[PDB]
Amino acid sequence: RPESELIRQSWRVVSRSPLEHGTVLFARLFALEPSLLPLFQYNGRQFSSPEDSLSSPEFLDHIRKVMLVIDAAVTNVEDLSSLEEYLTSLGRKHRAVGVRLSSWSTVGESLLYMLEKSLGPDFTPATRTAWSRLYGAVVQAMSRGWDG
Numbered sequence: 845r846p847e848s849e850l851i852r853q854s855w856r857v858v859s860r861s862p863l864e865h866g867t868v869l870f871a872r873l874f875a876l877e878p879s880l881l882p883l884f885q886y887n888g889r890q891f892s893s894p895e896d897s898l899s900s901p902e903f904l905d906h907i908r909k910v911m912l913v914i915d916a917a918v919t920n921v922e923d924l925s926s927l928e929e930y931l932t933s934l935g936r937k938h939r940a941v942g943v944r945l946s947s948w949s950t951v952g953e954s955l956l957y958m959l960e961k962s963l964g965p966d967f968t969p970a971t972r973t974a975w976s977r978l979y980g981a982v983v984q985a986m987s988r989g990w991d992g
């Protein structure tokens with residue numbers, strides 16, 4: 845598939861420095877949805893501001909975790925059914941931490957933003973549309989952990 849190679853090529857760029865790029869994703873994410881901030885509760889405490897998150901070692905671990913799950917979705921872009929059950933369950937984890945179903949889309953905007961920024965001119969509108977579908981399948985699946 846063409847799509848699937850696009851994602852794969854585009855992804856490599858980001859895969860190189862996943863902490864740096866995941867950092868973009870999350871900054872963007874809290875800029876768009878600041879009510880995600882207090883969901884992280886490392887050592888009982890809420891981050892006050894977004895910049896506090898970037899100073900938490902646990903938060904930066906979570907970014908790495910995030911980017912590895914995206915990795916997996918990338919490896920498996922042609923057959924993504926194969927991560928469905930993982931992701932549903934990842935979804936239910938997150939419903940427990942308090943993420944709303946609607947926050948998921950914001951994560952996808954944030955994910956595309958992080959890509960658009962990384963790829964600059966390279967973020968072709970085919971590239972865009974492919975990610976949007978990928979990450980979209982990833983939430984159709986993370987979203988699944990809300991059921992019923």
Ligand code: HEM
Pocket residue numbers: 880883884885902905906909910911913914934937938941943947948951
């Ligand atoms: C949308 C906002 C998000 C918030 C507020 C959030 C928050 C959390 C929190 C508080 C935890 C548990 C603490 C921890 O392990 O650090 C967690 C776990 C995790 N998150 Fe997120 N998260 C978000 C999005 C995502 C996304 C997009 C992914 C991946 C695509 C992701 C992947 C993970 C994984 C892999 C874990 C470990 C889950 C496990 O116990 O198996 N998170 N997240």
